[PDB]
């Protein structure tokens, strides 16, 4: 563990160094992202059954 | 005694990092989202059963075409399925019985698997001579292969029971970059969409974010109380989710550098085995050793629905790239496709 | 009622059975008759660089058996020219300088002993031991070895496995019959005894002694002892399967013919002396040498018979009075005096004197009173008629010394001492052994108790293999080849299942049967036991993790494996043969124990709350 504690120190040097953002901004963007892509999420916004392979789509290529 | 001064120095830095974060924690996701409408009751049903593995299924992975998927089983086989029809595209009998994971390459040209062989075997599914064959055995790890994901046909990232991860040049068959840091076996990894970073989750109860080019751990997320079994990236690349033996899922933000949300309920006591988001990020689907897959409102922490159609542990799941479908694989030997 | 070999897939199971016991080695296989025959077959036809060595080997072995020096002088030169000078000049001679010189050095001086080529035997074996041998194991001929070895290790003899003809010799406990073994056709004598009569006479230790002495004596294919091939029991009898002898005993023939010429006694004694040499090299004193116990075959050649009084003197030396009174030695009669082989050499001289004169040297026509018989042994130096030759005289005086440290066979070197007597100076003992001297008499054509008898059944590998090699071995090989050529041609027209065991990590495979009997083909892997019906691939299995235990249980008088499963469920497996039982039991236990250790390490694979 002679060396072991030394890289642990300097690894934290790296980790503590990055500049951060507030959670409000973080959460705001996640929330915003979802809302922008909600229309394109088939588990949220169902598509016509005839375009759904797992319900009624008949032609496939 | 030199080690004295370095452990306290590690604490003063432990605290410094907690401080910078505590300072950023001005609100919660739950508060910020408390206004938006709930997703409502999600009641998906099973649209396909995949029958053909002879024992426990341990891992699955979708093709980028949202149609084909590979699964890996206790029976010693990979099976590549065509979900649309139920047909089998290939049955790959493996050299080692003890496989634990499998990956499908973005191109569709290869698949990978590994397990207690401590080897990541790359299967070429487009041999000049119309055959399926092992085209490389990536040897190097000193523990069991726990997960793996292609970046491209010539590159792949693997996690191991030896506590490490690595990037491989498939032609060279060597570790280009190794990723050391974890103190317990690594269980899972997820590539960022840009594939410049990836996160790992390990039995040390923490997840790390890695720079693929530099080979360094950039950030390290704690909070979980037991082993992290599963991990995946939120679709924009700025956050990721994890599932753990502590019966919780959690969502961590990269830029905010901390946990935003915990998904649990007093009933759910079993451990999480697998996690993935819907195409938009709004849903977080997670598999349990209680035989169900729970669907969560990733933004509000509400349980939105249950997928209950397996008679043993749900060991793996995946959401198609096109978002149309969820695949669950179980210890009962079946995969089901839900919609 | 015929031999049928298992299928080639039995190799998977049998090779491991043999590896576990160190039997897959050159020495062990090469020194078994059928192993030898299969190994020569491999070299002669399927491997070019082995051919000359085996050819050379069999030429030496033929050379060993040549009778006269002049025959040997001729054949030695043939062998040298063919297998030595030619190869040497053909740069095809993989043997040492020392080897070449030893023979050539001897051949130049016309010294041609039977063992001239021994150093070449050693170096042939050296050249066969390694790669050649490994290539043998890779081939179909080792597979055929396994098929035959399976049959051997599975023998359970009954009465139904024979065909009895007619009685021969009653005794105290039981009797002897003439039989034919259906399997092959080999004619044997079946000596049977009754446990009830044995129990009623408490002769358990007697019956016991004979089987133990018989196994100690029934290897080497000795011509001059009635040897055993098998032993087995039924609820009611013990069965020895002995070499057949139709010609009756010398006691009977002495009574019909009357006393024999010196020339004719010489013949018998010669054969007897080689019998005793055999028992004495294996540390056994026969102890009841008398004319009743010497048996004649159809040609008139002789064998020593009933071993019920024979004794093992290697470890502990016997002191007890045992035998018949007119043939025991001073040592044998004395209170608590040790003796060894010396007893028979006295007995022998007593019995040879009987053949010559009609009675024991120490019996002057009395019956119950062995006491006089005994005291004439311990004081009276035997009077011989002037009729005797002095050659015969010295032999009988040698053989009949009362001091052990004086008599023939006793101080120095056993049988060799007797053989060197003047009486036998005309004999060539190589010929006496090969049974070439003409016999003087051609006989004329026309519940708790049962555990004492455990470990009584027996098969003498060397005996059984000999029987097979001299009857069916050839024809059954050709037959069972034909079957497999048909099955090979069959499978390719049915799109052959390019074997499911290849190129994975299968531990073992082969047939067994279950209930849920249903016969399926099984493949054992580290984490599971798969199985299948014929046509399909395996579509059902058991995992190692769910197997709790592997006990053994009996079902309708048959041995089967009982596997206990996690959910309180049970699995019964039946095997074709005893080695399959032993080996599926072991490998299944090793596998499940080792897998359940692995899984416990792997947090993704083990069970949790
Ligand atoms: C002639 N012969 C004998 C003679 N001995 C014999 C035969 C049958 C039964 C018994 C027997 O009961 N033996 C046990 C026994 C019974 C009573 C007294 C002594 C002994 C003994 F010490 F000899 F074991 C012996 N044994 N085998 C043969 C025989 C061998 C080959 N071909 C034909 C016959």
PDB file of N, CA and C in Angstrom, chain A residues 1-2 5-6 8-16 18-31 33-35 37-38 40-44 47 51-55 57 60-61, chain B residues 3 6 9-10 13 17 20-21 24-27 29 32 36 39 42 44 47-48 83-84 216-220 234-236 251 253 255-257 278-280 282 322-325 337 339:
ATOM      1  N   UNK A   1       0.824  -1.241   0.000  1.00  0.00           N
ATOM      2  CA  UNK A   1       0.000   0.000   0.000  1.00  0.00           C
ATOM      3  C   UNK A   1       0.849   1.280   0.000  1.00  0.00           C
ATOM      4  N   UNK A   2       2.177   1.123   0.019  1.00  0.00           N
ATOM      5  CA  UNK A   2       3.104   2.257  -0.083  1.00  0.00           C
ATOM      6  C   UNK A   2       2.667   3.176  -1.225  1.00  0.00           C
ATOM      7  N   UNK A   5      -1.713   4.440  -1.784  1.00  0.00           N
ATOM      8  CA  UNK A   5      -2.321   5.663  -1.247  1.00  0.00           C
ATOM      9  C   UNK A   5      -1.929   6.930  -2.021  1.00  0.00           C
ATOM     10  N   UNK A   6      -0.908   6.824  -2.869  1.00  0.00           N
ATOM     11  CA  UNK A   6      -0.345   7.977  -3.573  1.00  0.00           C
ATOM     12  C   UNK A   6      -1.134   8.295  -4.838  1.00  0.00           C
ATOM     13  N   UNK A   8      -4.177   7.257  -5.262  1.00  0.00           N
ATOM     14  CA  UNK A   8      -5.501   7.586  -4.726  1.00  0.00           C
ATOM     15  C   UNK A   8      -5.624   9.083  -4.438  1.00  0.00           C
ATOM     16  N   UNK A   9      -4.562   9.669  -3.889  1.00  0.00           N
ATOM     17  CA  UNK A   9      -4.518  11.110  -3.635  1.00  0.00           C
ATOM     18  C   UNK A   9      -4.613  11.886  -4.945  1.00  0.00           C
ATOM     19  N   UNK A  10      -3.727  11.568  -5.884  1.00  0.00           N
ATOM     20  CA  UNK A  10      -3.664  12.291  -7.156  1.00  0.00           C
ATOM     21  C   UNK A  10      -4.862  12.023  -8.075  1.00  0.00           C
ATOM     22  N   UNK A  11      -5.542  10.894  -7.881  1.00  0.00           N
ATOM     23  CA  UNK A  11      -6.764  10.607  -8.634  1.00  0.00           C
ATOM     24  C   UNK A  11      -7.885  11.542  -8.181  1.00  0.00           C
ATOM     25  N   UNK A  12      -7.940  11.811  -6.880  1.00  0.00           N
ATOM     26  CA  UNK A  12      -8.894  12.773  -6.328  1.00  0.00           C
ATOM     27  C   UNK A  12      -8.574  14.194  -6.802  1.00  0.00           C
ATOM     28  N   UNK A  13      -7.285  14.493  -6.937  1.00  0.00           N
ATOM     29  CA  UNK A  13      -6.822  15.761  -7.508  1.00  0.00           C
ATOM     30  C   UNK A  13      -7.525  16.011  -8.843  1.00  0.00           C
ATOM     31  N   UNK A  14      -7.578  14.974  -9.678  1.00  0.00           N
ATOM     32  CA  UNK A  14      -8.276  15.043 -10.962  1.00  0.00           C
ATOM     33  C   UNK A  14      -9.772  15.176 -10.760  1.00  0.00           C
ATOM     34  N   UNK A  15     -10.326  14.313  -9.911  1.00  0.00           N
ATOM     35  CA  UNK A  15     -11.774  14.235  -9.726  1.00  0.00           C
ATOM     36  C   UNK A  15     -12.355  15.542  -9.177  1.00  0.00           C
ATOM     37  N   UNK A  16     -11.717  16.105  -8.153  1.00  0.00           N
ATOM     38  CA  UNK A  16     -12.173  17.363  -7.540  1.00  0.00           C
ATOM     39  C   UNK A  16     -12.030  18.596  -8.440  1.00  0.00           C
ATOM     40  N   UNK A  18     -12.793  19.232 -11.833  1.00  0.00           N
ATOM     41  CA  UNK A  18     -13.726  19.642 -12.884  1.00  0.00           C
ATOM     42  C   UNK A  18     -14.686  20.719 -12.373  1.00  0.00           C
ATOM     43  N   UNK A  19     -15.065  21.647 -13.250  1.00  0.00           N
ATOM     44  CA  UNK A  19     -16.066  22.655 -12.891  1.00  0.00           C
ATOM     45  C   UNK A  19     -17.480  22.087 -13.119  1.00  0.00           C
ATOM     46  N   UNK A  20     -18.387  22.421 -12.200  1.00  0.00           N
ATOM     47  CA  UNK A  20     -19.689  21.770 -12.073  1.00  0.00           C
ATOM     48  C   UNK A  20     -20.852  22.697 -12.437  1.00  0.00           C
ATOM     49  N   UNK A  21     -22.057  22.131 -12.432  1.00  0.00           N
ATOM     50  CA  UNK A  21     -23.295  22.860 -12.686  1.00  0.00           C
ATOM     51  C   UNK A  21     -24.242  22.636 -11.511  1.00  0.00           C
ATOM     52  N   UNK A  22     -25.211  23.524 -11.335  1.00  0.00           N
ATOM     53  CA  UNK A  22     -26.256  23.354 -10.324  1.00  0.00           C
ATOM     54  C   UNK A  22     -27.209  22.251 -10.752  1.00  0.00           C
ATOM     55  N   UNK A  23     -27.857  21.608  -9.786  1.00  0.00           N
ATOM     56  CA  UNK A  23     -28.791  20.525 -10.085  1.00  0.00           C
ATOM     57  C   UNK A  23     -29.996  21.054 -10.839  1.00  0.00           C
ATOM     58  N   UNK A  24     -30.468  22.233 -10.449  1.00  0.00           N
ATOM     59  CA  UNK A  24     -31.586  22.869 -11.130  1.00  0.00           C
ATOM     60  C   UNK A  24     -31.354  22.901 -12.632  1.00  0.00           C
ATOM     61  N   UNK A  25     -30.189  23.374 -13.066  1.00  0.00           N
ATOM     62  CA  UNK A  25     -29.853  23.347 -14.499  1.00  0.00           C
ATOM     63  C   UNK A  25     -29.797  21.905 -15.030  1.00  0.00           C
ATOM     64  N   UNK A  26     -29.196  21.005 -14.260  1.00  0.00           N
ATOM     65  CA  UNK A  26     -29.069  19.591 -14.648  1.00  0.00           C
ATOM     66  C   UNK A  26     -30.429  18.939 -14.858  1.00  0.00           C
ATOM     67  N   UNK A  27     -31.270  19.037 -13.834  1.00  0.00           N
ATOM     68  CA  UNK A  27     -32.620  18.511 -13.887  1.00  0.00           C
ATOM     69  C   UNK A  27     -33.426  19.225 -14.975  1.00  0.00           C
ATOM     70  N   UNK A  28     -33.284  20.541 -15.078  1.00  0.00           N
ATOM     71  CA  UNK A  28     -33.970  21.302 -16.128  1.00  0.00           C
ATOM     72  C   UNK A  28     -33.712  20.697 -17.506  1.00  0.00           C
ATOM     73  N   UNK A  29     -32.460  20.365 -17.807  1.00  0.00           N
ATOM     74  CA  UNK A  29     -32.107  19.825 -19.127  1.00  0.00           C
ATOM     75  C   UNK A  29     -32.655  18.422 -19.362  1.00  0.00           C
ATOM     76  N   UNK A  30     -32.544  17.555 -18.363  1.00  0.00           N
ATOM     77  CA  UNK A  30     -33.146  16.229 -18.455  1.00  0.00           C
ATOM     78  C   UNK A  30     -34.638  16.339 -18.749  1.00  0.00           C
ATOM     79  N   UNK A  31     -35.335  17.111 -17.917  1.00  0.00           N
ATOM     80  CA  UNK A  31     -36.758  17.361 -18.097  1.00  0.00           C
ATOM     81  C   UNK A  31     -37.017  17.912 -19.483  1.00  0.00           C
ATOM     82  N   UNK A  33     -35.060  17.705 -22.219  1.00  0.00           N
ATOM     83  CA  UNK A  33     -34.769  16.665 -23.202  1.00  0.00           C
ATOM     84  C   UNK A  33     -35.945  15.715 -23.406  1.00  0.00           C
ATOM     85  N   UNK A  34     -36.437  15.132 -22.311  1.00  0.00           N
ATOM     86  CA  UNK A  34     -37.579  14.216 -22.378  1.00  0.00           C
ATOM     87  C   UNK A  34     -38.712  14.836 -23.163  1.00  0.00           C
ATOM     88  N   UNK A  35     -39.052  16.063 -22.795  1.00  0.00           N
ATOM     89  CA  UNK A  35     -40.195  16.762 -23.356  1.00  0.00           C
ATOM     90  C   UNK A  35     -40.027  17.012 -24.855  1.00  0.00           C
ATOM     91  N   UNK A  37     -38.307  14.986 -26.821  1.00  0.00           N
ATOM     92  CA  UNK A  37     -38.331  13.690 -27.505  1.00  0.00           C
ATOM     93  C   UNK A  37     -39.527  12.805 -27.160  1.00  0.00           C
ATOM     94  N   UNK A  38     -40.514  13.342 -26.450  1.00  0.00           N
ATOM     95  CA  UNK A  38     -41.690  12.563 -26.037  1.00  0.00           C
ATOM     96  C   UNK A  38     -42.506  12.067 -27.227  1.00  0.00           C
ATOM     97  N   UNK A  40     -41.565  11.269 -30.070  1.00  0.00           N
ATOM     98  CA  UNK A  40     -40.834  10.241 -30.820  1.00  0.00           C
ATOM     99  C   UNK A  40     -40.586   8.955 -30.043  1.00  0.00           C
ATOM    100  N   UNK A  41     -41.183   8.832 -28.851  1.00  0.00           N
ATOM    101  CA  UNK A  41     -41.022   7.665 -27.972  1.00  0.00           C
ATOM    102  C   UNK A  41     -42.267   6.787 -28.046  1.00  0.00           C
ATOM    103  N   UNK A  42     -42.176   5.629 -28.717  1.00  0.00           N
ATOM    104  CA  UNK A  42     -43.360   4.792 -28.948  1.00  0.00           C
ATOM    105  C   UNK A  42     -43.960   4.142 -27.705  1.00  0.00           C
ATOM    106  N   UNK A  43     -43.178   4.044 -26.642  1.00  0.00           N
ATOM    107  CA  UNK A  43     -43.689   3.525 -25.380  1.00  0.00           C
ATOM    108  C   UNK A  43     -44.469   4.595 -24.608  1.00  0.00           C
ATOM    109  N   UNK A  44     -44.372   5.845 -25.066  1.00  0.00           N
ATOM    110  CA  UNK A  44     -45.139   6.957 -24.502  1.00  0.00           C
ATOM    111  C   UNK A  44     -46.250   7.378 -25.441  1.00  0.00           C
ATOM    112  N   UNK A  47     -47.844   4.439 -31.818  1.00  0.00           N
ATOM    113  CA  UNK A  47     -47.817   4.633 -33.253  1.00  0.00           C
ATOM    114  C   UNK A  47     -48.951   3.801 -33.816  1.00  0.00           C
ATOM    115  N   UNK A  51     -47.962   0.020 -38.374  1.00  0.00           N
ATOM    116  CA  UNK A  51     -46.523   0.306 -38.453  1.00  0.00           C
ATOM    117  C   UNK A  51     -45.743  -0.394 -37.342  1.00  0.00           C
ATOM    118  N   UNK A  52     -46.457  -1.027 -36.415  1.00  0.00           N
ATOM    119  CA  UNK A  52     -45.815  -1.723 -35.300  1.00  0.00           C
ATOM    120  C   UNK A  52     -45.602  -3.190 -35.621  1.00  0.00           C
ATOM    121  N   UNK A  53     -44.337  -3.601 -35.798  1.00  0.00           N
ATOM    122  CA  UNK A  53     -44.011  -5.002 -36.022  1.00  0.00           C
ATOM    123  C   UNK A  53     -44.602  -5.967 -34.990  1.00  0.00           C
ATOM    124  N   UNK A  54     -44.784  -5.518 -33.759  1.00  0.00           N
ATOM    125  CA  UNK A  54     -45.268  -6.413 -32.716  1.00  0.00           C
ATOM    126  C   UNK A  54     -46.772  -6.360 -32.471  1.00  0.00           C
ATOM    127  N   UNK A  55     -47.519  -5.771 -33.405  1.00  0.00           N
ATOM    128  CA  UNK A  55     -48.977  -5.749 -33.325  1.00  0.00           C
ATOM    129  C   UNK A  55     -49.683  -6.100 -34.638  1.00  0.00           C
ATOM    130  N   UNK A  57     -48.161  -5.038 -38.195  1.00  0.00           N
ATOM    131  CA  UNK A  57     -47.415  -4.724 -39.416  1.00  0.00           C
ATOM    132  C   UNK A  57     -47.337  -5.996 -40.231  1.00  0.00           C
ATOM    133  N   UNK A  60     -42.737  -6.214 -44.505  1.00  0.00           N
ATOM    134  CA  UNK A  60     -41.432  -6.002 -43.878  1.00  0.00           C
ATOM    135  C   UNK A  60     -40.364  -5.995 -44.949  1.00  0.00           C
ATOM    136  N   UNK A  61     -39.290  -5.313 -44.905  1.00  0.00           N
ATOM    137  CA  UNK A  61     -38.199  -5.342 -45.869  1.00  0.00           C
ATOM    138  C   UNK A  61     -36.885  -5.409 -45.149  1.00  0.00           C
TER     139      UNK A  61
ATOM    140  N   UNK B   3       2.041   6.700   5.317  1.00  0.00           N
ATOM    141  CA  UNK B   3       0.645   6.426   4.980  1.00  0.00           C
ATOM    142  C   UNK B   3      -0.345   7.226   5.846  1.00  0.00           C
ATOM    143  N   UNK B   6      -1.260  10.542   3.959  1.00  0.00           N
ATOM    144  CA  UNK B   6      -1.965  10.383   2.687  1.00  0.00           C
ATOM    145  C   UNK B   6      -3.438   9.995   2.853  1.00  0.00           C
ATOM    146  N   UNK B   9      -5.104  13.256   3.869  1.00  0.00           N
ATOM    147  CA  UNK B   9      -5.118  14.022   2.617  1.00  0.00           C
ATOM    148  C   UNK B   9      -6.237  13.527   1.678  1.00  0.00           C
ATOM    149  N   UNK B  10      -6.477  12.216   1.671  1.00  0.00           N
ATOM    150  CA  UNK B  10      -7.587  11.629   0.910  1.00  0.00           C
ATOM    151  C   UNK B  10      -8.948  12.030   1.492  1.00  0.00           C
ATOM    152  N   UNK B  13      -9.685  15.702   0.671  1.00  0.00           N
ATOM    153  CA  UNK B  13     -10.149  15.723  -0.709  1.00  0.00           C
ATOM    154  C   UNK B  13     -11.529  15.079  -0.842  1.00  0.00           C
ATOM    155  N   UNK B  17     -14.688  17.366  -2.345  1.00  0.00           N
ATOM    156  CA  UNK B  17     -15.550  16.917  -3.432  1.00  0.00           C
ATOM    157  C   UNK B  17     -17.021  16.891  -2.999  1.00  0.00           C
ATOM    158  N   UNK B  20     -18.154  20.694  -2.910  1.00  0.00           N
ATOM    159  CA  UNK B  20     -18.458  21.281  -4.214  1.00  0.00           C
ATOM    160  C   UNK B  20     -19.819  20.799  -4.727  1.00  0.00           C
ATOM    161  N   UNK B  21     -20.150  19.545  -4.424  1.00  0.00           N
ATOM    162  CA  UNK B  21     -21.441  18.959  -4.792  1.00  0.00           C
ATOM    163  C   UNK B  21     -22.593  19.476  -3.927  1.00  0.00           C
ATOM    164  N   UNK B  24     -23.779  22.556  -5.144  1.00  0.00           N
ATOM    165  CA  UNK B  24     -24.558  22.493  -6.375  1.00  0.00           C
ATOM    166  C   UNK B  24     -25.990  22.012  -6.143  1.00  0.00           C
ATOM    167  N   UNK B  25     -26.217  21.332  -5.020  1.00  0.00           N
ATOM    168  CA  UNK B  25     -27.508  20.720  -4.738  1.00  0.00           C
ATOM    169  C   UNK B  25     -28.492  21.763  -4.259  1.00  0.00           C
ATOM    170  N   UNK B  26     -28.982  22.591  -5.182  1.00  0.00           N
ATOM    171  CA  UNK B  26     -29.892  23.688  -4.836  1.00  0.00           C
ATOM    172  C   UNK B  26     -31.357  23.289  -4.918  1.00  0.00           C
ATOM    173  N   UNK B  27     -31.640  22.209  -5.634  1.00  0.00           N
ATOM    174  CA  UNK B  27     -32.994  21.672  -5.714  1.00  0.00           C
ATOM    175  C   UNK B  27     -32.898  20.186  -5.991  1.00  0.00           C
ATOM    176  N   UNK B  29     -34.537  16.982  -8.653  1.00  0.00           N
ATOM    177  CA  UNK B  29     -35.269  16.591  -9.823  1.00  0.00           C
ATOM    178  C   UNK B  29     -36.745  16.432  -9.493  1.00  0.00           C
ATOM    179  N   UNK B  32     -38.299  19.777  -9.277  1.00  0.00           N
ATOM    180  CA  UNK B  32     -38.324  20.403 -10.608  1.00  0.00           C
ATOM    181  C   UNK B  32     -39.357  19.808 -11.546  1.00  0.00           C
ATOM    182  N   UNK B  36     -45.060  18.615 -13.926  1.00  0.00           N
ATOM    183  CA  UNK B  36     -45.417  17.974 -15.186  1.00  0.00           C
ATOM    184  C   UNK B  36     -46.353  16.795 -14.952  1.00  0.00           C
ATOM    185  N   UNK B  39     -46.922  10.015 -16.300  1.00  0.00           N
ATOM    186  CA  UNK B  39     -46.948   9.233 -17.520  1.00  0.00           C
ATOM    187  C   UNK B  39     -48.237   8.410 -17.602  1.00  0.00           C
ATOM    188  N   UNK B  42     -48.774   2.615 -17.543  1.00  0.00           N
ATOM    189  CA  UNK B  42     -48.158   1.886 -18.652  1.00  0.00           C
ATOM    190  C   UNK B  42     -48.471   0.397 -18.510  1.00  0.00           C
ATOM    191  N   UNK B  44     -47.972  -2.553 -20.798  1.00  0.00           N
ATOM    192  CA  UNK B  44     -47.425  -3.321 -21.907  1.00  0.00           C
ATOM    193  C   UNK B  44     -47.758  -4.788 -21.741  1.00  0.00           C
ATOM    194  N   UNK B  47     -45.593  -9.668 -26.619  1.00  0.00           N
ATOM    195  CA  UNK B  47     -45.958  -9.835 -28.028  1.00  0.00           C
ATOM    196  C   UNK B  47     -45.238 -11.015 -28.678  1.00  0.00           C
ATOM    197  N   UNK B  48     -44.219 -11.531 -28.011  1.00  0.00           N
ATOM    198  CA  UNK B  48     -43.442 -12.649 -28.505  1.00  0.00           C
ATOM    199  C   UNK B  48     -42.914 -13.402 -27.318  1.00  0.00           C
ATOM    200  N   UNK B  83     -36.695 -11.087 -33.872  1.00  0.00           N
ATOM    201  CA  UNK B  83     -37.870 -10.820 -33.061  1.00  0.00           C
ATOM    202  C   UNK B  83     -39.174 -10.732 -33.852  1.00  0.00           C
ATOM    203  N   UNK B  84     -39.113 -10.164 -35.046  1.00  0.00           N
ATOM    204  CA  UNK B  84     -40.310  -9.946 -35.835  1.00  0.00           C
ATOM    205  C   UNK B  84     -41.032 -11.268 -36.087  1.00  0.00           C
ATOM    206  N   UNK B 216      -8.444   7.377 -18.347  1.00  0.00           N
ATOM    207  CA  UNK B 216      -8.544   7.843 -16.969  1.00  0.00           C
ATOM    208  C   UNK B 216      -9.995   7.818 -16.473  1.00  0.00           C
ATOM    209  N   UNK B 217     -10.151   7.561 -15.176  1.00  0.00           N
ATOM    210  CA  UNK B 217     -11.418   7.743 -14.476  1.00  0.00           C
ATOM    211  C   UNK B 217     -11.579   9.233 -14.234  1.00  0.00           C
ATOM    212  N   UNK B 218     -12.636   9.818 -14.782  1.00  0.00           N
ATOM    213  CA  UNK B 218     -12.886  11.243 -14.625  1.00  0.00           C
ATOM    214  C   UNK B 218     -13.673  11.530 -13.360  1.00  0.00           C
ATOM    215  N   UNK B 219     -14.749  10.782 -13.148  1.00  0.00           N
ATOM    216  CA  UNK B 219     -15.621  10.975 -11.995  1.00  0.00           C
ATOM    217  C   UNK B 219     -16.069   9.619 -11.451  1.00  0.00           C
ATOM    218  N   UNK B 220     -16.452   9.603 -10.177  1.00  0.00           N
ATOM    219  CA  UNK B 220     -16.807   8.381  -9.461  1.00  0.00           C
ATOM    220  C   UNK B 220     -18.018   8.613  -8.569  1.00  0.00           C
ATOM    221  N   UNK B 234     -28.384   7.605 -20.027  1.00  0.00           N
ATOM    222  CA  UNK B 234     -29.539   8.370 -20.471  1.00  0.00           C
ATOM    223  C   UNK B 234     -29.255   8.844 -21.920  1.00  0.00           C
ATOM    224  N   UNK B 235     -30.290   8.922 -22.780  1.00  0.00           N
ATOM    225  CA  UNK B 235     -30.037   9.064 -24.226  1.00  0.00           C
ATOM    226  C   UNK B 235     -29.231  10.276 -24.701  1.00  0.00           C
ATOM    227  N   UNK B 236     -29.183  11.356 -23.934  1.00  0.00           N
ATOM    228  CA  UNK B 236     -28.423  12.543 -24.355  1.00  0.00           C
ATOM    229  C   UNK B 236     -26.928  12.483 -24.022  1.00  0.00           C
ATOM    230  N   UNK B 251     -30.239   7.496 -10.474  1.00  0.00           N
ATOM    231  CA  UNK B 251     -29.899   8.304 -11.644  1.00  0.00           C
ATOM    232  C   UNK B 251     -28.816   9.279 -11.228  1.00  0.00           C
ATOM    233  N   UNK B 253     -26.131  12.421 -12.565  1.00  0.00           N
ATOM    234  CA  UNK B 253     -25.820  13.416 -13.618  1.00  0.00           C
ATOM    235  C   UNK B 253     -24.327  13.629 -13.678  1.00  0.00           C
ATOM    236  N   UNK B 255     -22.473  16.281 -15.249  1.00  0.00           N
ATOM    237  CA  UNK B 255     -22.118  17.691 -15.048  1.00  0.00           C
ATOM    238  C   UNK B 255     -22.380  18.191 -13.634  1.00  0.00           C
ATOM    239  N   UNK B 256     -23.494  17.761 -13.054  1.00  0.00           N
ATOM    240  CA  UNK B 256     -23.807  18.060 -11.658  1.00  0.00           C
ATOM    241  C   UNK B 256     -22.997  17.162 -10.723  1.00  0.00           C
ATOM    242  N   UNK B 257     -22.529  16.024 -11.238  1.00  0.00           N
ATOM    243  CA  UNK B 257     -21.565  15.175 -10.537  1.00  0.00           C
ATOM    244  C   UNK B 257     -22.137  14.533  -9.269  1.00  0.00           C
ATOM    245  N   UNK B 278     -36.308   4.176 -22.096  1.00  0.00           N
ATOM    246  CA  UNK B 278     -37.040   4.288 -23.357  1.00  0.00           C
ATOM    247  C   UNK B 278     -36.290   5.281 -24.208  1.00  0.00           C
ATOM    248  N   UNK B 279     -36.687   5.404 -25.465  1.00  0.00           N
ATOM    249  CA  UNK B 279     -35.977   6.221 -26.419  1.00  0.00           C
ATOM    250  C   UNK B 279     -35.838   7.669 -25.936  1.00  0.00           C
ATOM    251  N   UNK B 280     -36.863   8.185 -25.248  1.00  0.00           N
ATOM    252  CA  UNK B 280     -36.889   9.593 -24.830  1.00  0.00           C
ATOM    253  C   UNK B 280     -36.247   9.836 -23.475  1.00  0.00           C
ATOM    254  N   UNK B 282     -37.724   9.169 -20.642  1.00  0.00           N
ATOM    255  CA  UNK B 282     -38.766   9.382 -19.639  1.00  0.00           C
ATOM    256  C   UNK B 282     -38.987   8.145 -18.775  1.00  0.00           C
ATOM    257  N   UNK B 322     -35.217   1.922 -31.892  1.00  0.00           N
ATOM    258  CA  UNK B 322     -36.409   2.602 -32.448  1.00  0.00           C
ATOM    259  C   UNK B 322     -37.460   2.828 -31.358  1.00  0.00           C
ATOM    260  N   UNK B 323     -37.211   2.294 -30.165  1.00  0.00           N
ATOM    261  CA  UNK B 323     -38.075   2.515 -29.020  1.00  0.00           C
ATOM    262  C   UNK B 323     -39.350   1.704 -29.009  1.00  0.00           C
ATOM    263  N   UNK B 324     -39.578   0.898 -30.051  1.00  0.00           N
ATOM    264  CA  UNK B 324     -40.833   0.148 -30.226  1.00  0.00           C
ATOM    265  C   UNK B 324     -41.045  -0.974 -29.236  1.00  0.00           C
ATOM    266  N   UNK B 325     -39.972  -1.436 -28.584  1.00  0.00           N
ATOM    267  CA  UNK B 325     -40.020  -2.714 -27.910  1.00  0.00           C
ATOM    268  C   UNK B 325     -38.970  -2.931 -26.811  1.00  0.00           C
ATOM    269  N   UNK B 337     -40.745 -10.359 -25.640  1.00  0.00           N
ATOM    270  CA  UNK B 337     -40.712  -9.025 -26.201  1.00  0.00           C
ATOM    271  C   UNK B 337     -42.009  -8.338 -25.784  1.00  0.00           C
ATOM    272  N   UNK B 339     -44.505  -4.667 -25.393  1.00  0.00           N
ATOM    273  CA  UNK B 339     -44.960  -3.511 -26.178  1.00  0.00           C
ATOM    274  C   UNK B 339     -46.322  -3.097 -25.607  1.00  0.00           C
TER     275      UNK B 339
END
